[PDB]
Symmetry: D2
Subunit: 215 residues, 4 copies
């Protein structure tokens, strides 16, 4: 079902500040190593007039290395799979909502994604494309109403220094009964490995590892 090497295909449809776009992706990862890489292409709405980094964490917690002592909500959910929904609340009032419905056929995951962003200041770092990268982060995972919730204090590093803060809340919903984990953490690191001038073509990497804190 979930093998050492898996492929990924995705389509994202979205609107940010009223600008409509479609992004398609293909990639590969190692679910048990917690690593993955994706090649993304803008199919409609090029050139994007906003910072590409707001999209990157929307482009699957299957790709997270879970130790034996923490139930793995995500890997347990397949073959049936799971979906997630997310809000991204930025410190200057920008708010994004996103969702991913993740299905599995053979060795390929398919992602149906929707992304919407509103209320970004026109002179802020998102609409002025002044972001460099997301910093690494630690997601706090806990069960609430029988499903799994993840909260994250995120930060974008900005051109010229300084950070731009965003708070993530993701709800994750398994499509079958699975053993629920106790409170735990997932450390993440996401990076754009390469892109062309207007980010019409982007190569993206993530590494993620689950853990129980200090210790």
């Amino acid at each position: 079902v979930i093998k050492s090497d898996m492929k990924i295909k995705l389509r994202m449809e979205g609107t940010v500040n009223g600008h409509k776009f479609v992004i398609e992706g293909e990639g590969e990862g190692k679910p048990y190593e917690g690593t993955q890489t994706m090649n993304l292409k803008v199919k409609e709405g090029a050139p994007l007039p906003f910072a590409y980094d707001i999209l990157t964490t929307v482009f699957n917690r299957v790709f997270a290395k879970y130790p034996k002592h923490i139930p793995d909500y995500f890997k347990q959910s397949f073959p049936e799979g799971y979906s997630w929904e997310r809000s991204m609340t930025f410190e200057d009032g920008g708010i994004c909502t996103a969702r991913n419905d993740i299905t599995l056929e053979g060795d390929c995951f398919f992602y149906e994604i929707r992304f919407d962003g509103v209320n970004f200041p026109p002179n802020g770092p998102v609409m002025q494309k002044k972001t460099l990268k997301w910093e690494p982060s630690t997601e706090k995972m806990y069960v609430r109403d029988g499903v799994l919730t993840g909260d994250i204090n995120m930060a974008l590093l900005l051109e010229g220094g300084g950070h731009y803060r965003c708070d993530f809340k993701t709800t994750y919903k398994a499509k079958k009964g699975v053993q629920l984990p106790d409170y735990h953490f997932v450390d993440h690191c996401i990076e754009i490995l390469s892109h062309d001038k207007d980010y019409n073509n982007v190569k993206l990497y993530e590494h993620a590892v689950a853990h129980s804190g200090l210790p």
Copy 2:
């Protein structure tokens, strides 16, 4: 351009808790009296599995009575028109994003609307359809970055008593240069006048009046 009687046509496409839907509407209003009525029909995704009230304030501040001493951002923007974007932050973590692009042809306004909702608790009043109505409200309007922003403390009255709080932030963007108003308020009252069992058919009314506070 904006006459004493105007017609309204709209299409809303949206997703709430992963449930996809399309709603079309036709209505009429009196821009200078600040009143309007709309007939809405669910075209795809019936029956809606969530509280219809979360949608109602997305179904145009042209329909607000502005006194002579407050510049009317909305009426001034036509014929070119305006668009708005909104976030709706509910007290139990549910978040909606919405947008409306408002165009005018002859005596008919046309609304292109997108609505997305995420992170609603499955036993909350929205997914359990336990809301009765929005209470009246007062929107705080102020200019920020050369465009108009409206903040609102909203509340849904619940079955069995009690309120469910939501905070609105709307940004309004004119498609041409207009005279900007000083800080002011818009009082609103929105009501569902009638509906059928699953809200496949709904008649909706709003009254709105701008003012400068106490006095």
Copy 3:
């Protein structure tokens, strides 16, 4: 008990950005007209290194004109009286907490107030004393857990234009059983009538009127 003319005495002890202070006040108001005036004097910590306006709304909803159709939580609570607690959440991360225990002896109200402010940016309008006034506002009043809660979208007008947003949540607790009101509003307007150079001496006025919205 609560007469057409009432006197007010107060002492505020507080800390903002680590700066300790004491302010004493004496004033008078007309509870049934919804108006009041106060003379305030800094007794310790002069000169205050922050914008005086953050304090003003802490210096009693007895002074609000309630119409016959809305139960008056505040006037009903006396002679025993009531206390309130408030949070003030500013858009740049500054947060204040405040409380007032309001007692009545004869024709004089006595206020025991505590005020604490934290996390104000050193180059923000509060620590740079760049605020001009609070705009008028409308408080949303509703019952939650058998006591009364008030939420307010507030805004300070800034030197050189622009607004600085703050969100108030106040809980009001009667010291005896009183008839609880349905959802309603209180319009407010607060103004500094005069002050000396470092605001060691300030004369302050408020007008407040309760109402049920549109209508």
Copy 4:
């Protein structure tokens, strides 16, 4: 200056839900190991009518193990020292503000602490003393306006299961010039080791370690 073994003395004055109290503490820690233990005694306001856990993280990032590659803001600030201010924003609307002014004499740290809590629901876990412990956490540390800010997604584990979420923002201010760190993390774990029936006497432990994320 900061030695392998240091002593700690503190006094906290505070008010929660209008209840006034004083807590004094004495303890010891190992700054370079990131560990510390404290004995706390209620001196005024016993028995506390609220969950003791809301106080525990207010009872000094000197006690955090910093690796060689991350500048240590806290240890660098002495002998002059530093102060911090914090807001604690709970998911049910409860808000606390706190501050600590940390001075050093010989081998003993002295803490002057103020704590204020407001707007806790009377049937919530704080006023009903239904909390068991804080979960471990990871603080996100970043420089903003030349001083250090820490944000934390915190959670209290509740009696009968479930979590109660709180968001911390702490600002840390050195009393002299120090080398500023790049974005980093501090993992924490705080535990009550023992207490008597009404928590008049409490023994508290914390372990904290700084790091740069994944890796």
